[PDB]
Amino acid sequence: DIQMTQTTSSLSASLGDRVTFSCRASQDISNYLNWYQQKPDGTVKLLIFYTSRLHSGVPSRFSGSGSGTDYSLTIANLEQEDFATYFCQQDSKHPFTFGSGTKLEIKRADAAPTVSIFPPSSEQLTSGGASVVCFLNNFYPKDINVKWKIDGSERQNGVLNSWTDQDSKDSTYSMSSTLTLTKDEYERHNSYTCEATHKTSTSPIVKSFNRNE
């Protein structure tokens, strides 16, 4: 299967920038490479067929460029609507294959997350489960890592993470992390920690509670 590699997963930019995406084929595709735009509501449009040919309705700031294995798409004069995810696809041989896509986010000043932890509620404990919730709100850039420690020893099973799309007001991001657990083991331990490692500080942001207090 022809493998279209698209190395950059996201790419941050601002209005008016020249921004480029690229694919690399696992073999010579002979200019049989197309580019699509998937908007946040999931709408997909054809941008460029063959390496460089431009589709009938596409505004003129798009263009194509490549040959052999390396192809790429650029936007001069980036406009607001252009914030979307861009996908490539090869027509050389059946079966056609796509690239992992590149999501074009909007650039912003760096922001440190707001980290906020919650013990398992009363309702749930009587029900038989245990869940700790760690919120992390309004940070930039999207890259962020969360570790859970139960009395200093790290847990990974039953951890459950979720991330908002880019906020349409303050361009930040946000993430939930929910350590989920059995009541029986929850009450065998005391301290519950979530650590947030993030570009905006060299030392991780820690939010903790002991089951006693």
* Residue ranges binding other proteins (CB under 8 A): 1, 34, 36, 38, 42-46, 49-50, 53, 55-56, 85, 87, 89, 91, 94-101, 114, 116-124, 127, 129, 131, 133, 135, 137, 158, 160-164, 174-176, 178, 180, 209, 213
Nearer to other proteins, 50 or 206 (CB): 50
Q: Which residues contact 186 (CB under 8 A, 6 or more apart)?
A: 120, 130, 211
Please say which residue, 77 or 208, places its beta carbon nearer to other proteins.
Answer: 208
Least distance CB 34 / other proteins (angstroms): 4
C-alpha span between 27 and 179 (Å, rounded): 44
Least separation in angstroms between CB 76 and other proteins: 18
Residue 117 or 205: the one with the smaller Cβ distance to other proteins is 117
Distances in Å between the alpha carbon of 62 and those of 14, 59, 93, 98? 16, 7, 26, 19
Looking at beta carbons only, is 17 or 114 nearer to other proteins? 114
Give CA–CA dist 130/136, Å, rounded. Answer: 20
Q: What's the closest the beta carbon of residue 114 comes to other proteins, in angstroms?
A: 7
107 neighbors 122 (Cβ within 8 angstroms): no
Nearer to other proteins, 17 or 31 (CB): 31
CB of 207 to other proteins, least distance (A): 11
Measured CA to CA, the distance from residue 123 to residue 86 in angstroms comes to: 45
Shortest distance, position 102 Cβ to other proteins, whole Å: 9
- From the list 174, 175, 184, 187, the residue with the least C-alpha distance to 119 is 187
The tokens for 208 are 């903790």
Nearer to other proteins, 41 or 184 (CB): 41
Q: What is the spatial distance between Cα 190 and Cα 148, in angstroms, rounded to a whole number?
A: 13
Strands 62-67 and 85-90 turn out to be unpaired
Closest approach, Cβ 79 to other proteins, in A, equals 21
